[PDB]
């Protein structure tokens, strides 16, 4: 019995279909396209880490841009919102800085007020009571 | 050459070799072939035991 490949056409079309949008001979020649489709798939897997990294970097720039309009720096906003137990991530703050400018200014005022409270507490030796917004809600 | 409900034979063998070993025996039950395979050598002990039941 002699066996020959009869469905070799279907084995090469499943790889060439991913290369139809390429440029040059690497969209129709199986030998050339297979080495490009594999690299395209490899870049697809490794770009999932970059997309998460790039989104956060984009959010930081947008948060920084809006903070400067209110005379604040990015470390001064994120750092002082943590001490108020306001757990808002960069995704929300970037959205708030774009679609809710009035709400973002309220957060900037809260962060600025909390920032000023820490400086006042740093000047004292603990005799004066803590700031109004410096109180922390305890959970048991 | 075990016929009938072989799983009843396993329980009797387990309750019989346990005092000699101090622990439950490790047995393989092959219903298709009707054979019981027991880890360890119990040739002389089981041959006398099966003669008691009249097999």
């Amino acid at each position: 019995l002699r066996n020959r490949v009869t469905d070799r056409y279907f084995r090469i079309q499943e790889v060439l279909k991913h290369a139809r949008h390429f440029r040059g001979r690497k969209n129709r020649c199986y030998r050339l396209a297979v080495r490009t489709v594999i690299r395209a798939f490899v870049k697809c897997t490794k770009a999932r880490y970059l997309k998460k990294k790039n989104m956060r970097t984009l959010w930081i720039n947008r948060i920084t841009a809006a903070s400067q309009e209110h005379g604040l720096k990015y470390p001064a906003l994120i750092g002082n919102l943590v001490k108020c137990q306001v757990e808002l991530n960069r995704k929300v703050l970037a959205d708030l800085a774009i679609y809710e400018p009035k709400t973002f200014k309220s957060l900037a005022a809260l962060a600025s007020r909390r920032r000023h409270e820490g400086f006042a507490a740093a000047l004292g030796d603990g005799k004066e009571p803590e700031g109004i917004f410096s109180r922390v809600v305890q959970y048991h | 050459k075990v016929e009938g409900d072989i799983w009843a034979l396993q329980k009797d063998v387990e309750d019989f070799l346990s005092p000699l070993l101090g622990k439950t025996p490790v047995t393989q039950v092959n219903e298709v072939t009707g054979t019981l395979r027991i880890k360890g050598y119990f040739d002389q002990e089981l041959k006398a035991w099966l003669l008691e039941k009249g097999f």
Partner: protein
């Protein structure tokens, strides 16, 4: 007694045994290994 009878009455409700529905005893025929694919192809052991 019960074991012998249970192996025959259960076979009645099953479809007809033919040359199609037969298979070897599991574990009695190891799959053949061929020098094909990534696992066994680069240098074929």
């Amino acid at each position: 007694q019960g074991g012998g009878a249970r192996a025959l009455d259960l076979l009645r409700g099953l479809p007809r045994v033919s040359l199609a529905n037969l298979k070897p005893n599991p574990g009695s025929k190891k799959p053949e290994r061929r020098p094909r694919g990534r696992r066994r192809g680069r240098k074929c052991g």
